[PDB]
mmCIF file of C-alpha atoms in Angstrom:
data_model
loop_
_atom_site.group_PDB
_atom_site.id
_atom_site.type_symbol
_atom_site.label_atom_id
_atom_site.label_comp_id
_atom_site.label_asym_id
_atom_site.label_seq_id
_atom_site.Cartn_x
_atom_site.Cartn_y
_atom_site.Cartn_z
ATOM 1 C CA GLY A 695 19.339 22.964 63.113
ATOM 2 C CA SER A 696 19.969 24.682 66.477
ATOM 3 C CA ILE A 697 23.693 25.495 66.958
ATOM 4 C CA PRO A 698 24.628 24.552 70.582
ATOM 5 C CA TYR A 699 27.898 26.596 70.429
ATOM 6 C CA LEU A 700 25.907 29.810 69.696
ATOM 7 C CA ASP A 701 22.261 29.338 70.738
ATOM 8 C CA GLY A 702 22.890 27.640 74.128
ATOM 9 C CA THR A 703 21.025 24.404 73.224
ATOM 10 C CA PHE A 704 23.504 22.034 74.987
ATOM 11 C CA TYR A 705 22.430 18.343 75.322
ATOM 12 C CA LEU A 706 25.417 15.888 75.662
ATOM 13 C CA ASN A 707 26.557 16.690 79.253
ATOM 14 C CA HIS A 708 25.570 13.180 80.455
ATOM 15 C CA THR A 709 28.348 11.742 78.214
ATOM 16 C CA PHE A 710 31.228 12.806 80.583
ATOM 17 C CA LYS A 711 32.654 10.068 82.907
ATOM 18 C CA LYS A 712 35.361 12.113 84.689
ATOM 19 C CA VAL A 713 37.895 14.921 84.459
ATOM 20 C CA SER A 714 41.311 15.110 86.117
ATOM 21 C CA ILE A 715 43.190 18.424 86.478
ATOM 22 C CA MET A 716 46.956 18.684 87.119
ATOM 23 C CA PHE A 717 49.338 21.672 87.472
ATOM 24 C CA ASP A 718 53.079 21.467 86.643
ATOM 25 C CA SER A 719 52.494 17.945 85.208
ATOM 26 C CA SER A 720 52.736 16.745 88.836
ATOM 27 C CA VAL A 721 50.296 18.350 91.282
ATOM 28 C CA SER A 722 46.759 16.965 91.224
ATOM 29 C CA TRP A 723 44.896 20.258 91.426
ATOM 30 C CA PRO A 724 41.967 20.010 93.910
ATOM 31 C CA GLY A 725 44.369 17.889 95.954
ATOM 32 C CA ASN A 726 44.314 18.162 99.766
ATOM 33 C CA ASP A 727 42.245 14.922 100.095
ATOM 34 C CA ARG A 728 39.169 17.094 99.145
ATOM 35 C CA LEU A 729 36.979 14.671 97.155
ATOM 36 C CA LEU A 730 35.976 11.030 97.952
ATOM 37 C CA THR A 731 38.191 9.994 95.021
ATOM 38 C CA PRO A 732 40.669 12.836 95.776
ATOM 39 C CA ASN A 733 42.698 12.753 92.592
ATOM 40 C CA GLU A 734 39.912 13.655 90.096
ATOM 41 C CA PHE A 735 36.290 14.678 89.492
ATOM 42 C CA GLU A 736 34.603 11.315 88.904
ATOM 43 C CA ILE A 737 31.472 12.804 87.240
ATOM 44 C CA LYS A 738 29.576 9.481 87.067
ATOM 45 C CA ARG A 739 30.034 5.714 87.700
ATOM 46 C CA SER A 740 29.342 2.329 86.015
ATOM 47 C CA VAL A 741 30.400 0.199 89.058
ATOM 48 C CA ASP A 742 30.122 1.512 92.636
ATOM 49 C CA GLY A 743 31.541 -0.852 95.290
ATOM 50 C CA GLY B 695 61.009 -27.779 115.299
ATOM 51 C CA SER B 696 61.962 -24.070 115.543
ATOM 52 C CA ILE B 697 59.298 -21.811 117.126
ATOM 53 C CA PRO B 698 59.422 -18.584 115.055
ATOM 54 C CA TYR B 699 57.117 -16.724 117.454
ATOM 55 C CA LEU B 700 59.596 -17.411 120.324
ATOM 56 C CA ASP B 701 62.986 -17.550 118.560
ATOM 57 C CA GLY B 702 62.689 -15.139 115.572
ATOM 58 C CA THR B 703 62.998 -17.718 112.687
ATOM 59 C CA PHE B 704 60.210 -15.992 110.620
ATOM 60 C CA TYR B 705 59.970 -17.576 107.108
ATOM 61 C CA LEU B 706 56.515 -16.703 105.541
ATOM 62 C CA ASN B 707 56.997 -12.945 104.892
ATOM 63 C CA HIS B 708 56.915 -13.539 101.094
ATOM 64 C CA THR B 709 53.225 -14.647 101.392
ATOM 65 C CA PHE B 710 51.728 -11.135 101.955
ATOM 66 C CA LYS B 711 50.124 -9.278 98.971
ATOM 67 C CA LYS B 712 48.763 -6.009 100.501
ATOM 68 C CA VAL B 713 47.785 -4.266 103.757
ATOM 69 C CA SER B 714 45.433 -1.275 104.205
ATOM 70 C CA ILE B 715 44.891 0.831 107.324
ATOM 71 C CA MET B 716 41.783 2.881 108.109
ATOM 72 C CA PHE B 717 41.199 5.036 111.240
ATOM 73 C CA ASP B 718 37.620 5.797 112.475
ATOM 74 C CA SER B 719 36.216 3.727 109.566
ATOM 75 C CA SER B 720 36.970 6.674 107.212
ATOM 76 C CA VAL B 721 40.469 8.167 107.131
ATOM 77 C CA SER B 722 42.706 5.894 105.073
ATOM 78 C CA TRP B 723 46.336 6.006 106.350
ATOM 79 C CA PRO B 724 48.900 7.203 105.267
ATOM 80 C CA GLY B 725 46.455 8.925 102.843
ATOM 81 C CA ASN B 726 47.609 12.359 101.546
ATOM 82 C CA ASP B 727 48.395 10.891 98.065
ATOM 83 C CA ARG B 728 51.744 9.698 99.483
ATOM 84 C CA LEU B 729 52.417 6.333 97.716
ATOM 85 C CA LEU B 730 51.685 5.087 94.196
ATOM 86 C CA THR B 731 48.625 3.203 95.595
ATOM 87 C CA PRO B 732 48.452 3.809 99.492
ATOM 88 C CA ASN B 733 45.020 3.989 100.170
ATOM 89 C CA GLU B 734 46.717 0.412 100.209
ATOM 90 C CA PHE B 735 50.377 -0.649 100.939
ATOM 91 C CA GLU B 736 50.851 -2.979 97.995
ATOM 92 C CA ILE B 737 53.602 -5.341 99.261
ATOM 93 C CA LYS B 738 53.825 -7.261 95.920
ATOM 94 C CA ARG B 739 51.867 -7.674 92.658
ATOM 95 C CA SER B 740 51.351 -10.770 90.432
ATOM 96 C CA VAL B 741 51.069 -8.742 87.187
ATOM 97 C CA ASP B 742 52.482 -5.281 86.538
ATOM 98 C CA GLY B 743 51.027 -3.128 83.740
#
């Protein structure tokens, strides 16, 4: 069928919940209290108090 | 009996679980990723994964 890696037909992006990013095994990258959950990119939620 | 409020005989300090501080209804203190959970000062925990 279509090959998403070559022909750009991506379709599973909704399946990500979050990503965290950390330099030197220690420094949470975006850091600096930037985001409303600062430590990580919480892409979506299941519970939202 | 003793009057802790007047004489200093405080004896219920072991009953606290956690305290959280929030200026302007937004800026959690101390914030800045300082402590292992200080958007809340966790005084004690009943179970410790």
